[PDB]
Assembly symmetry: C5
Homo-oligomer: 94 residues x 5
């Protein structure tokens, strides 16, 4: 089992080399709070333009299935969350 809480108020580096296998990210879940603003999580692989991975809507869509693979070769990964609420990534190691 694998999980990471990405906080909103600062872009967050993640290093897949710290995991003993390939990371399967299979879900994003909205963290606690009262904010009704959309929460978007973006991903940049070293210094490339960020790509939006999903978009959660408080009281409508508070989780969504993903199917992403991060390995050693994804040098530094940078996760950025828009909005006032954390996004919980979950999945498993291969």
């Amino acid at each position: 089992f694998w999980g990471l809480e990405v906080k909103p108020g600062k872009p967050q580096a993640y290093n897949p080399k710290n995991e003993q296998g390939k990371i399967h990210v299979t879900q994003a879940t909205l963290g606690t709070g009262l904010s009704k603003e959309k929460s978007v999580i973006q991903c940049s692989i070293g210094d490339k333009a960020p790509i939006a991975l999903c978009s959660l809507l408080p009281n409508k869509i508070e989780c969504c299935p993903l199917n992403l693979e991060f390995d050693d070769d994804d040098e530094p990964v940078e996760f950025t969350v828009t909005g006032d609420r954390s996004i919980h990534l979950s999945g498993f190691l291969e």
Copy 2:
């Protein structure tokens, strides 16, 4: 086939298992039901969030291993969450 009803309130201990769905249990509560997972001593991670009368099930893709470690499922709200999937 594999399935587990996680009851709300008191954290539920568990321990290859493919978890592929969460479904909202019976009850009248309109409050969100969130299921979290905490490994051993680690901070719990939210696995999904179900909304009565809007989203009452969601697809998952989780793997828990043969070794069987210390996993704790915690459900927020007044309603059980039915995990389903299979074993290979």
Copy 3:
């Protein structure tokens, strides 16, 4: 290798000796605005469909079955075999 199974509401339903991948529940025909839940046993909930909101959902599922559906509408299971 298509596969389909309309579970009607009311009394449950058996299964065929020979592997089945169920990958979708779809809400059957009807006017009922009631929640339709489908369940399995070996009695666990597989999914929950809401008329005029969520009328299908993706599944990933693989000795006695018995399917039972809650609600006024049937649920169409679909997928394939391996």
Copy 4:
């Protein structure tokens, strides 16, 4: 190996998997253009058998849904039937 098929509403539409060079993985249904707010259901009947609903799309609520279906040679004639006034775009890939 991208694969896609637009199923038009009304008259049932026959599909022959023998025309594809591999097994067909259908993974998405997407609602076609149109102003109709009526639900769009796509059904599948293989042999002469009874049709099975594959999904149900709701204009301005749920206009696509993930699928995981496999069609091969053995699915003799497949008949797709769409309810409503809007086409359904099936997409996926071929397995060689």
Copy 5:
């Protein structure tokens, strides 16, 4: 092996899978920034073939959706076309 592509609206956008070191698994579409409430549809054409809708995102209702598509050296120029005023972010992974 993370993979991502922002498809901009309006002018169709050519994509070449031969430029990637393995097979492309597209597994999500996410709605780009913007204030437009209009539907965003992404379509795909492989060479000369009529475009097929891959999904349909609804601002403030459905702003991402799971996909399961495979692009290989084939298709050559998979032309992606986005309806609406907002980019669509495709994400997924490479299979080596």
